Structures are given as structure tokens and as C-alpha cells.
């Protein structure tokens, strides 16, 4: 019985960027893993369909960093309230284990068809 | 301590002339018709060393 993420994750907050340049103050959303280490967000989502890099804020003072993305995969991601399209880019350089925990949490515990 | 600096330089000139007398006697022995025929068919001129006695030698010892 090898189970993926036998304990769930939490946290959703802050922003990221859409224009490598812009990321003015509020672009897209970051998802999960405060990450014991400190802060390591596993995955990213968006209400839009245009995001090249993302200056996602982080702890300390040098929190600014280019948390860029890669070719996405979109889902219907039906909100309980109603339908809403959301394109899921993954953090550049994620490994197959983390993309398993993320997918397991936001699909099996959320309303997706 | 200066006889010993002389001794060593005289010696340094006797080994520098013995390796030279070797690397020029193990060279006049390369049938340079069968050796320039595989360094030429090589892509860049590099070949494995284990195939030089195997394809360009004249004598076999079993």
C-alpha cells in the first residue's frame, strides 16, 4: 500500500507574476506546502492564460525571485458555486512526486470532473 | 652544499638525454604507410590505442 501524500497539505495566498516584467503587485495564485524548510510553493494556478515568469514573494528580504513556469495543462475545475476555467502551470523544475501530491489534493478533495 | 647542486645538474643532463634517446628510437619503428592509413580514416584523427598494435603490427607472439 504505497500511498501518495498520506497527510494532506494546506495554504493558498499571495501572488506571482504574468509579465516577467510586470508582476506589478497581484498576478495569479500560488498553491501549497509552506514547506517545512521555510517556504517552497509546489504548484501554481491562474485565472488567465498568459504567464511567462512570476516574481512570487517569499520570506526574509530577498523574497523576490523568478518563479517561472512551463507549458500548462488546463482543467474545467468546476467551482462548487459554478464553472471556472483555470490553467495550471507547474513550478519550473518540479519532480513527479510533488506533482502527485499537488494533483491528489486539488482534485480528489476538490470538485473536478 | 654546492658540490651537491653541481652533482644533480650533471645528473639532470644525463637523464634528459636518456629519455630523448628513447623517444627517438621507439619512433623509428612505425611502418608509416599502415599507420597513416588509420589516422586518416579516423573522423578527427583520434583512435583508441588498443587497436594500433592490433591492425598495424608486423609480428605476433602467442
Amino acid at each position: 500500500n504505497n500511498e501518495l501524500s498520506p497527510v494532506a497539505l494546506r495554504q493558498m495566498s499571495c501572488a506571482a507574476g504574468t509579465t516577467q516584467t510586470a508582476c506589478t503587485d497581484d498576478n495569479a495564485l500560488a498553491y501549497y506546502n509552506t514547506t517545512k524548510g521555510g517556504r517552497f510553493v509546489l504548484a501554481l494556478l491562474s485565472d488567465l492564460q498568459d504567464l511567462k515568469w512570476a516574481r512570487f514573494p517569499k520570506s526574509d528580504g530577498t523574497g523576490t525571485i523568478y518563479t517561472e513556469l512551463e507549458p500548462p495543462c488546463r482543467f474545467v475545475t468546476d467551482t462548487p458555486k459554478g464553472p471556472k476555467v483555470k490553467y495550471l502551470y507547474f513550478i519550473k523544475g518540479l519532480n513527479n512526486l510533488n506533482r502527485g501530491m499537488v494533483l491528489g489534493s486539488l482534485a480528489a478533495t476538490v470538485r473536478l470532473q | 652544499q654546492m658540490y651537491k647542486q653541481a652533482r644533480s645538474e650533471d645528473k639532470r643532463a644525463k637523464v634528459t638525454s636518456a629519455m630523448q634517446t628513447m623517444l627517438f628510437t621507439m619512433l623509428r619503428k612505425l611502418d608509416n604507410d599502415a599507420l597513416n592509413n588509420i589516422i586518416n580514416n579516423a573522423r578527427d584523427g583520434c583512435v583508441p590505442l588498443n587497436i594500433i598494435p592490433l591492425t598495424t603490427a608486423a609480428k605476433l607472439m602467442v
Partner: protein, 104 residues
């Protein structure tokens, strides 16, 4: 323990479902635990033959060939396709001493 000794797979009871096209096989304790058996049993001894057939004769290679980098990257894709970590055939392009040990 979910692949018998013929290659057939069979416990699908701890698998989740996502949108088609994005599935993530997690193979990291399957390959790593199996690794010491891949050289004891000499698994890849049928790759020296002319059609990967244990009956047809051996491959006669060029004697002046020494690179073998395009065939090292094709052996990784045939058997270890979903092993997610960069493989450097020539370890002079590695990134630290824990990458030299992985790629060698």
C-alpha cells in the same frame, strides 16, 4: 510487488484519477530497489545482437568508434523513460559530486 514475473501489473487501488493526458507514474522505489539485479542477471545482454534478438549474431561495430553517446541516450529512453532526473552520459557536464555518482 505488483508485477508478477511476466511483466503484468495488478493493484490499482491506491491510484487517483485526473484529466486525461496528465498522469504521473511515480517510479523511484521500483527502479532503485531493482538496480542491483540488472547486472547480476545480465539483463541487457540482448542489446549486443543485430536486431535485439538472442538468436541473430552479434553486432559488428566500427573499430575506430569511441563515442557511444547517441546509443547511451537511447538505452536510457527505452528502459528508464519515466525516471525524472537529468542523465549526463559524459560526467564532465555534471553539477556536483552527487550528480557524478548518479550518472556514473
Amino acid at each position: 510487488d505488483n508485477q508478477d514475473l511476466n511483466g503484468n501489473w495488478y493493484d490499482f487501488g491506491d491510484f487517483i484519477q485526473t484529466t486525461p493526458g496528465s498522469g504521473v507514474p511515480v517510479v523511484d522505489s521500483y527502479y532503485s530497489l531493482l538496480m542491483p539485479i540488472l547486472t547480476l542477471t545480465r539483463a541487457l545482454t540482448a542489446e549486443s545482437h543485430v536486431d535485439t534478438d538472442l538468436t541473430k549474431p552479434y553486432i559488428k561495430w566500427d573499430l575506430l568508434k569511441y563515442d557511444f553517446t547517441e546509443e547511451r541516450l537511447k538505452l536510457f529512453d527505452r528502459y528508464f523513460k519515466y525516471w525524472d532526473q537529468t542523465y549526463h552520459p559524459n560526467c564532465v557536464n555534471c553539477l556536483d559530486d552527487r550528480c557524478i555518482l548518479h550518472c556514473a
